């Protein structure tokens, strides 16, 4: 109550609003970086892979006598004079630049289309002084400076050139490669300015504007509080009343949250966000790493920098997901201490409301919010927005309304799914009008509405603290043009994915969404039928229902329609659980006909939930019951629950036609007390189902790896993840067994071989990432030496006769210097028991008798080379000599079999082979299971060349690799041209027949290509500056 | 081809395609029927009738 607090509020609020409007347009400081190619004055290939795929400018100028060492005798395999891609790549011709020599003409192919050409003896003339070339976003142009055309289609005497316009013909650069070796001549200057438009930094003026704007916003809200305390009333607390205490229900919810934090399924996007947050410190900005050309997360993701600071202690999965655990605890304590005692007296004194609020909270939290996504932030922000607004209405004060505006604008920019907070923002307009219209008669309009504007615009200092306005606008338009962006009428796709048979449409997610819709419909029907739900307050009940409906309507304007975007309803679900429990009791709903119909509806949506699989994501699915089939004991849970639903309808019809009630009949029993809360029983039954299913998944694979076993190992060191339980053989030529009779040639097909193909495999289908010891000419996988490994086969191009193969006797090693596996490699499509092992002792093989038989098992895509494996625990400890055996059961020419000799591999773990220092190309799924391995960096538009690659399993790799491909951005558009892959044998340490994924080596085409060095500078740019358009690959 | 009772979402998934099954006329008819039914149910709940 002072005039000074009425002047300070106006002045500070207007200054904060002006400094917030001004700050996206203030200058920055770009770091300019260009590539001048001849580094030390010699012909040497360099390696500079650009992340935006193209430079904003390119200029090469080759003299005449540079190409003197390009033609001569027939000892010249030297084709290219200059390139921006390695010529050995399959896609090198239709993506980059070449000044390659076709047989007698020196031509430069740019983006698959020729630009200029000339005969080579005319280039080596004393004319043709240059080979000027230039590339831009509108035209490319080449020119032989010195000569003209001859007797051809063009008239001679026109000074030969070539231009291509009307399309973006800029070449992709992954380095500058060549095929010469001498000292470089004069001239010969390639130059390219790299697009480092996001490598900015604030200037002094922008930094002072951000500091002064935040200070003025704080001073304006302090003056707003001094105005609000004019009526004589003091503080006396901040928190609710029963905050520092525990009950049994709080202990139960806390125990379920902690145990799900350890043995719990994770979401899909955790390695994505962890890899982004790990590389963003060296990059200097927050780039989206797997897609869209290195464009940043432009207004969204203010908290990824907090995750990047949080990850300096350790990158373990129990450490990185600990703020999400704290958000879940805070969310339930806000629900039970602030919302439920606010919704009335019948909601506050009843216990069934508390139990079903806890149940719907856990049923939304557990399948949907165990990760690094922005979903818990948005859920807790919607609750805190509603609680601040609801406290502003009661005490009739404006400062909690301004705090709610700050929190709502803060959670609006967590992710694109944060648009659900506009429900809690739009419901808070009527209350704000009611509060402002009461105070305006003694303070005014400016003094009450300038801190509201300052608090509304304080978030622009957080969005635009690193980027400019032009960068974020053009990047958002470009991401909408390139990537997957569905419109508002494609909202049915989210609900079509909810009803699939996949991890998107599993039991838990489907149950959560259908139970939310049921509780919302019952609350709306009881609000329409009576005036309100009877024992509850009017305003808060209305505002809960309105916020939930506007959240459902606002969720259709998101660019992607996924199923894990329903995790924003985890705070509203406890509130609707309390309302839908009060709306069902005998005090509110008086007829038992209606209560039996509601119980039947609960049973019907529970029946509809179990009509799918118990499927979870990538490695959360190991060992889980019913993870690939419908849950059933003998019939199916869905048919049993449908029968119970029909029986409940028949009981309701008998209640209808008999004309009977309950109030002088059933006072209280124990099952009658259990029966009146259908939502509590259904929600806690599904919560116990989920928790017990992942605990049993952890128990079924105990010596093998599981998610929960790694999270419980992490309490005692061992924070590497899956990298300790994957065995890797580097050299696949090491543990070959030795035969007893003839040497290592024909000893594969020693004693019986009819239909044996030493070159009898199809050369076209059998392919994986001369002369042989068997006379073979086939390609061997996994780095097998053709001079030591014989190959047989069972394929032919004529009429097919049956084939029987029977090997020689192979000596077995000692039982301490032997690995856990016996491996043969095999190609072709065949059945389970086609290839077998036949072990014997010394005297059993001297008598030529079987002695035993085990069968190989297989993991792999057929018909390509794969590894067949069998443990040595299946071979009894008295066996000394083994022998292979094979037979093809007809099935026409397409069916076949290929075979190599037996091998006991010498295995090391993946943490010892792939260390913690080499750059690894991780996929966007394999990020939280491999936390010790580091991804590759990028600093000024140039990326670091990886050495390894880790993939998911085959079903997961063939459906998720189009995120990272060439058509969307992606680092698989760079390594597709620069590097060649090579598979490595890898086995899961105790669950040998499981497809965990795969590992690859990445080898350069030119091994003598050093990294480049860039010439750095500093330029002061403005807030609307833009160097060049963003080229989209189409 | 015989789908079960829990495959009832497939009829609406076909209604929201871009094909002669999900054309303008059929989609308008079904959505207008659902709108009129919801308004009738809401007015029957709110008042007596
Ligand atoms: C195609 C993969 C999807 C989800 O499955 N990832 C969504 C993108 N992740 C966002 C941040 C988690 C970045 O835009
Ligand atoms: Ca055959």
Query: Closest ligand 1 atom to the C-alpha of A273?
Result: 12
Cβ distance A137 to A61 under 8 Å? no
Q: Which residues of B touch A499 (CB under 8 A)?
A: 9, 13
Cβ distance A30 to A200 under 8 Å? yes
Residue A877, number of CB atoms within 10 A of its CB: 7
| A1011: Cβ contacts below 8 Å, ≥ 6 apart | A46, A47, A48, A945
Strand A857-858 vs strand A948-951: parallel, antiparallel, or unpaired?
Answer: unpaired
The 10 Å CB-count burial string (b at 16+, else e) for A908-931 is: eebbebbeeeebbbbbbbbbbbbb
A783: nearest Cα among A732, A827, A736:
A732
Find where tokens 């659902």 sit: B34
Q: For residue A203, what are the CA distances in angstroms to A283, A302, A695, A1018?
A: 19, 21, 54, 12
| A903: Cβ contacts below 8 Å, ≥ 6 apart | A732, A735, A736, A737, A822, A823, A824, A825
Shortest Cα–Cα distance, B21 to chain A (Å): 15
Q: Which residues of B touch A608 (CB under 8 A)?
A: 6
CA A154 to chain centre: 55
Question: Which of B6, B16, B46 is closest, CB to CB, to A608?
Answer: B6
The DSSP string of A642-700 is HHHHHHHHHHHHHHHHHT--STTT----SHHHHHT-HHHHHHHHHHHHHHHHHHHHHHH
CA distance A113 to B18: 38
Strand A46-47 vs strand A1010-1011: parallel, antiparallel, or unpaired?
Answer: parallel
CA A632 to chain centre: 32
Burial of A259 (0-12, 13-18, 19+ CB in 10 A): middle
Instruction: Report the separation in Å between the CA atom of A963 and the middle of ligand 1, taken as the mean of its atom positions.
Output: 9
Residue B6, chain A, CB below 8 Å: the answer is yes
Q: For residue A304, what are the CA distances in angstroms to A307, A479, A774?
A: 5, 19, 58
A39: nearest Cα among A214, A245, A178, A200:
A178
Find where tokens 């900015």 sit: A200
- The ligand with the least distance to the CA atom of A834 is 2
Query: Closest ligand 1 atom to the C-alpha of A272?
Result: 12
Instruction: Dig out the tokens for A148 from the structure.
Output: 């003209």
Answer whether A269 contacts ligand 1 (Cβ < 6 A): yes
Q: Do A496 and B45 touch (CB under 8 A)?
A: no
- The ligand with the least distance to the CA atom of A924 is 1
Q: For residue A682, what are the CA distances in angstroms to A370, A584, A913?
A: 22, 15, 49
Give Dmax over CA atoms of chain A in angstroms.
117
CA distance A863 to A826: 9
Q: How far apart are the first and last CA of chain B?
A: 44
A841: nearest Cα among A808, A811, A868:
A811
Q: Do B46 and A499 touch (CB under 8 A)?
A: no
Strand, coil or helix: A132? strand
Q: Do A492 and B6 touch (CB under 8 A)?
A: no
Q: Do B6 and A611 touch (CB under 8 A)?
A: yes
Instruction: Dig out the tokens for A930 from the structure.
Output: 């491999």
Strand A752-754 vs strand A726-728: parallel, antiparallel, or unpaired?
Answer: unpaired
CA distance A36 to A671: 83
Q: What is the three-state SS of A272-299? A: HHHHHHHHHHHHCCCECCCCCCCCECCC
| A470: Cβ contacts below 8 Å, ≥ 6 apart | A1023, A1024, A1025, A1026
CA distance A647 to A640: 11
Strand A948-951 vs strand A920-922: parallel, antiparallel, or unpaired?
Answer: parallel
CA A629 to chain centre: 26
Strand, coil or helix: A819? coil
Query: Closest ligand 1 atom to the C-alpha of A415?
Result: 11
Instruction: Dig out the tokens for A544 from the structure.
Output: 């809960």
Phi/psi zone of residue A570: left (φ > 0), alpha (ψ -120 to 50 degrees), beta?
Answer: alpha
CA distance A581 to A519: 9
Q: Which residues of A touch B13 (CB under 8 A)?
A: 492, 496, 499
Instruction: Dig out the tokens for A290 from the structure.
Output: 């797997």
Helices (H) and strands (E) counted in chain A, each on its own, are 29, 35
Residues 25-44 of B with CB under 8 A from A: 42
Between A322-334 and A375-395, two packed helices, what is the crossing angle to 10 degrees? 30
Nearest-10 Cα torsion for A269, A273, A274, A275: 110
Q: Which helix (H) or strand (E) holds A727?
A: strand A726-728
Residue A394, number of CB atoms within 10 A of its CB: 11
Q: For residue A468, what are the CA distances in angstroms to A24, A206, A412, A451, A475?
A: 6, 11, 20, 26, 11
Query: φ, ψ for residue B24 (rounded to 5)?
Result: -70, -45
Cβ distance A687 to A366 under 8 Å? yes
Cβ distance A294 to A471 under 8 Å? no
Instruction: Dig out the tokens for A115 from the structure.
Output: 């630009």
CA distance A833 to A395: 78
Experimental technique: cryo-EM
The 10 Å CB-count burial string (b at 16+, else e) for A263-287 is: bbbbbbbbbbbbbbbbbbeebbbbb
Q: How far apart are the first and last CA of chain A?
A: 64
CA distance A30 to A1004: 32
CA distance A311 to A1011: 29
| A734: Cβ contacts below 8 Å, ≥ 6 apart | A905, A906
Answer whether A963 contacts ligand 1 (Cβ < 6 A): yes
DSSP bridge partners of A1015: A34
Resolution in A: 2.8
Burial of A620 (0-12, 13-18, 19+ CB in 10 A): buried
Q: For residue A368, what are the CA distances in angstroms to A260, A272, A407?
A: 12, 16, 22
The DSSP string of B28-45 is HHHHHHHHHHHHHHHHHH
Answer whether A115 contacts ligand 1 (Cβ < 6 A): no
Cβ distance A298 to A476 under 8 Å? yes
CB pairs under 8 A between A and B: 19
Q: Which residues of B touch A611 (CB under 8 A)?
A: 6
Nearest-10 Cα torsion for A49, A50, A51, A52: -150
Strands (E), A907-966: 908-909, 920-922, 948-951
Cβ distance A308 to A277 under 8 Å? yes
Instruction: Dig out the tokens for A88 from the structure.
Output: 């050995």
Residue A767, number of CB atoms within 10 A of its CB: 11
Q: For residue A712, what are the CA distances in angstroms to A260, A311, A323, A687, A709?
A: 12, 19, 18, 22, 5
Helices (H) and strands (E) counted in chain B, each on its own, are 2, 0
Instruction: Dig out the tokens for A84 from the structure.
Output: 């921006």
Candidate of A267, A269, A293 to mutate for ligand 1, largest count of ligand atoms within 8 Å of Cβ: A269
Instruction: Dig out the tokens for A543 from the structure.
Output: 């505002």
The 10 Å CB-count burial string (b at 16+, else e) for A651-672 is: ebeebeeeeeeeeeeeeeeeee
Instruction: Dig out the tokens for A877 from the structure.
Output: 């400890």
């Amino acid at each position: 109550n002072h005039r000074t607090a009425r002047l300070v509020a106006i002045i500070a609020g207007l200054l904060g609003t002006l400094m917030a409007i001004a700050t996206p347009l203030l200058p920055v400081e770009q770091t300019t970086a260009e590539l001048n190619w001849p580094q030390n004055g010699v012909w040497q290939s360099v390696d500079a892979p650009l992340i935006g795929y193209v430079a904003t400018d390119l200029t090469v100028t080759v003299p005449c006598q540079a190409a003197a060492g390009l033609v001569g005798p027939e000892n010249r395999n030297r084709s290219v004079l200059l390139s921006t891609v390695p010529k050995q790549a399959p896609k090198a011709i239709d993506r980059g630049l070449l000044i390659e020599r076709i047989n007698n003409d020196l031509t430069v192919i740019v983006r698959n289309t020729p630009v200029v050409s000339a005969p080579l003896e005319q280039v080596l003339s004393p004319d043709c002084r240059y080979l000027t070339f230039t590339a831009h976003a509108d035209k490319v142009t080449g020119e032989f400076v010195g000569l003209t055309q001859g007797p051809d289609d063009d008239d001679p005497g026109e000074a030969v050139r070539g231009e291509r316009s009307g399309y973006d013909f800029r070449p992709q650069i992954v380095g500058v490669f060549t095929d010469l070796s001498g000292p470089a001549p004069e001239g010969l200057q390639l130059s390219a300015t790299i697009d480092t438009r996001y490598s900015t930094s604030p200037t002094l003026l922008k930094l002072l504007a951000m500091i002064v704007g935040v200070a003025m916003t704080v001073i304006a809200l302090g003056a707003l509080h001094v105005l609000d305390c004019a009526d004589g009333r003091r503080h006396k607390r901040f928190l609710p009343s029963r905050w520092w205490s525990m009950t049994p229900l709080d202990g139960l919810v806390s125990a379920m949250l902690v145990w799900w934090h350890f043995v719990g399924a994770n979401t899909a996007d955790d390695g994505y966000i962890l890899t982004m947050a790990r590389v963003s410190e060296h990059a200097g900005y927050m780039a989206n790493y797997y897609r869209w050309f290195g464009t940043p997360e432009s207004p969204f993701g203010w908290y990824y920098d907090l995750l990047a600071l949080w990850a300096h202690v350790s990158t373990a999965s129990v450490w990185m997901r600990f703020p999400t655990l704290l958000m879940g605890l805070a969310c339930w304590w806000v629900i039970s201490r602030e919302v439920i005692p606010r919704l009335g007296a019948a909601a506050k004194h009843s216990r069934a409301a508390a139990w079903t609020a806890a149940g719907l909270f856990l049923a939304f939290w557990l399948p949907l919010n165990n990760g690094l996504r922005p979903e818990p932030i948005i859920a807790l922000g919607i609750l805190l927005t509603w609680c601040s607004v609801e406290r502003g209405v009661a005490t009739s004060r404006l400062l909690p309304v301004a705090v709610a505006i700050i929190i709502g604008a803060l959670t609006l920019f967590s992710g694109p799914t944060g648009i659900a907070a506009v429900g809690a923002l739009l419901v808070a307009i009527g209350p704000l009008k009611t509060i402002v219209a009461a105070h305006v008669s003694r303070f005014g309009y400016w003094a009450l509405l300038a801190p509201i504007a300052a608090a509304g615009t304080v978030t622009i200092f957080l969005i635009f603290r690193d980027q400019t306005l032009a960068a974020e606008l053009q990047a958002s338009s470009f991401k909408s043009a390139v990537g997957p962006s569905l419109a508002w009428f494609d909202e049915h796709i989210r609900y079509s994915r909810l009803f699939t048979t996949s991890p998107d449409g599993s039991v838990a997610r489907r149950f959560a969404v259908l139970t939310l819709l049921l509780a919302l419909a019952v609350s709306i029907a009881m609000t329409l039928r009576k005036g309100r739900i009877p024992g509850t307050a009017l305003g808060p009940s209305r505002r809960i229902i309105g916020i939930t409906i506007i959240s459902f309507l606002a969720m259709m304007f998101t660019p992607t329609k996924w199923t894990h975007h329903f995790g924003v309803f985890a705070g509203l679900a406890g509130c609707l659980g309390a309302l839908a429990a009060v709306a069902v009791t005998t005090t509110a709903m008086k007829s038992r006909r209606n209560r039996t119909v509601f119980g039947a509806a609960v049973l019907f949506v529970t029946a509809l939930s179990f009509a799918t699989v118990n499927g979870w994501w990538y490695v959360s699915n190991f060992g889980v019951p019913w993870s690939n089939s419908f849950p059933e004991f003998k019939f199916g849970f869905t048919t049993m629950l449908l029968g119970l639903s029909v029986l409940a309808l028949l009981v309701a019809a008998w209640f209808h036609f008999s004309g009977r009630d309950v109030s002088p009949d059933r006072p209280q029993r124990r099952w009658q007390r259990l029966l009146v809360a259908p939502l509590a029983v259904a929600t806690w039954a599904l919560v116990i189902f989920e928790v017990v299913s992942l605990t049993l998944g952890m128990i079924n694979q105990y010596p093998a790896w599981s998610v929960g076993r790694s999270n419980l190992n992490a309490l005692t060191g061992k924070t590497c993840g899956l990298a300790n339980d994957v065995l890797v053989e580097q050299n696949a030529n090491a543990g070959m067994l030795t035969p007893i009779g003839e040497p290592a040639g024909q000893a594969l097909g020693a004693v019986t071989s009819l239909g044996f193909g030493p070159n009898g495999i199809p050369s076209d289908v059998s392919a994986d990432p001369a002369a042989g010891i068997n006379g073979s000419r086939a390609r061997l996988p996994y780095g097998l030496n053709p001079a030591t490994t014989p190959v047989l086969g069972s394929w032919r191009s004529g009429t097919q006769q049956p084939a029987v193969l029977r090997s020689a006797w192979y000596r077995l090693p000692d039982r301490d210097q032997a690995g856990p596996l016996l491996v043969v490699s095999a190609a072709g499509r065949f059945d389970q028991g086609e290839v077998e092992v036949q072990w014997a002792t010394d005297e059993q093989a001297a008598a030529n008798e079987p002695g035993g038989s085990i069968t190989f098992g297989d993991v792999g895509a057929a018909p390509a080379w794969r590894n067949l494996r069998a443990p040595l625990s299946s071979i009894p400890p008295e066996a000394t000599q083994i022998r292979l055996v094979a037979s093809d059961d007809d099935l026409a020419p397409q069916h076949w079999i290929a075979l190599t000799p037996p091998r006991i591999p010498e295995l090391r773990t993946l943490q010892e082979v792939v260390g913690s220092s080499d750059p690894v190309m991780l996929d966007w799924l394999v990020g939280l299971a491999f936390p010790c391995q580091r991804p590759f960096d990028h600093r000024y538009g140039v990326v670091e060349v990886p050495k390894w690659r880790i993939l998911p399993d085959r079903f997961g790799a063939e459906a998720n690799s189009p995120v990272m491909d060439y058509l969307g951005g992606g680092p698989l558009g760079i390594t597709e041209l620069l590097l060649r892959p090579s598979s490595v044998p890898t086995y899961l340490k105790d669950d040998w027949y499981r497809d965990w994924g795969s590992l690859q080596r990445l080898t350069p085409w030119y091994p003598d290509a050093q990294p480049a060095r860039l010439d750095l500078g500093t330029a002061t740019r403005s807030g609307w500056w833009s160097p060049a358009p963003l080229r989209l690959s189409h």
